[model samples]
Target chain A: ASLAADTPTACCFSYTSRQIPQNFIADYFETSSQCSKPGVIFLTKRSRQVCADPSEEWVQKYVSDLELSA
Target chain B: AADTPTACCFSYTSRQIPQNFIADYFETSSQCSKPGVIFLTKRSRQVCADPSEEWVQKYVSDLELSA
Candidate 1:
């Protein structure tokens, strides 16, 4: 029988203002629903998750570029 | 064994989980064969759900509202 894995969900309670380097981000996604603030979660090259405010200029641009790349 | 990246779901369920029981939710990685919404229940269980479902969309929309 096949069993599903317990995946962790990204739910941001707070967000960072610092801009993450584009090259350092391997992937990105919006934070979970029910969170108070809208967030952009960046997956770093080293497999770390950074919670950032989606309204930040850099974060918005990065997400836009990523969408174009997809 | 290692876990799949927390952002992705290898499988999913359409179990129609109640909204109040859900604490949070996020979309699955683009790399996944099937796009899904991973709901974090108040019980802390990670449940993968179909993003296209009406109930799932409502939960997502409700969560998007700013406090």
Candidate 2:
């Protein structure tokens, strides 16, 4: 059976740290998927980039606390 | 192979989200975790600020924003 691709639960980051849109974070597929492990790439609006593995200690801490908007 | 990281990098360089649609990310919630998200200041505070807290505030100013 054909399986679906890996997708992040909720990811977004902006240049200004303002109300970030899903597209902002969603756009960085290539950069983040590069990591050998499961992770996400967050690019700031200003062009800064960050790679995060969901299971990583830091990612776990941040995601665990986040209250996503419905 | 399309989902491969290599393809993703290629796509990033080729694609552009246009200034109008590029992204105007705002904060979805005032409550944030310490050391939250990328580019966030690592300093501890009452609540961690999303990297774009300024714009999120602007978004909130619009009554229809929440509506």
Candidate 3:
């Protein structure tokens, strides 16, 4: 009977190439319909969300790592 | 499923919203086609404004300080 906290899904209209250092990232999810480009939104340790290109090797590795941990 | 980033704005309004009416705000993703600051009104409506505007910057500064 307990409620869960709402997770905010991203709707990106733009994206940045500035890669976030891996250590700073804590979680991430992929962008869909409301978004223009297919991208990944990284949730930083500070709880800030940033959008990065999904095609990048580092980004891909991060997602893979997260999947393993999940 | 999670809710969309309803706080994200695809367009901006040049109209200056009174600072008093704003309860909170968030920045658009750097990946967005345009940069903006989305202000949440006291009533919980989202209004997008260009970050370059002095009024919007002022709100951001004040809000951060208040936070």
Candidate 4:
């Protein structure tokens, strides 16, 4: 099998302090580690506050093979 | 059922290479690359750098298969 082809898509997220609830860092880290195991890369762009709704759109555009699933 | 012989297993920690370890391992001066951005891995304690296609194949092939 072509491993590269089977590689999971990278996931990107941009979170602002205000947008994310307190103690969210711990949750994010835990989720990130789980995601990374299945060949998923997590890119976090921090310390920025842009349009709240638009951030999701931007992440989807930049991150390849990303699925926004809760 | 009884326990069977298991192969080798290894673990690593990120704290070993704290302070922009990713950038150092990837050989990027900045947190993110400019113009053309690519995530390349180099030798490090947290994650194995230079995990090329051949290396990945070998890892999968060599690993014990459990069913």
Most DockQ-accurate candidate:
3
Chain B TM-score, all predictions listed? 0.80, 0.20, 0.84, 0.20
User: What shift in Å separates residue A54 of candidate 2 from its native position after superposition?
Assistant: 5.4
Best by TM-score: 3
Model 3, C-alpha of A2: deviation from truth (Å): 30
How accurate is chain B of model 1, given as a TM-score from 0 to 1?
A: 0.80
Error of 4 at A3 (Å): 3.6
The pairs that clash in candidate 1 are none
Misplaced by over 4 Å in model 1 are: A1-70, B1-6
| Candidate 4, superposed: residue stretches over 4 Å from native | A5-8, A13-19, A24-26, A29-70, B1-67
Error of 4 at A31 (Å): 9.5
True contacts kept of each: 0.00, 0.00, 0.24, 0.00
Give the winner by lDDT: 2 or 3: 3
What does the lDDT read for residue A42 in candidate 3?
Answer: 88
- Interface RMSD values for all candidates: 14.3, 9.7, 6.7, 14.5
The full ranking of all candidates by lDDT, starting with the best, is 3, 1, 2, 4
Residue-wise lDDT of candidate 3 within A27-46, one digit each (tens)?
89887655567888888664
Model 3 CA deviation exceeding 4 Å by range: A1-70, B1-7
Candidate 2 vs candidate 4: the lDDT winner is 2
TM-scores, all candidates, are 0.45, 0.23, 0.47, 0.15
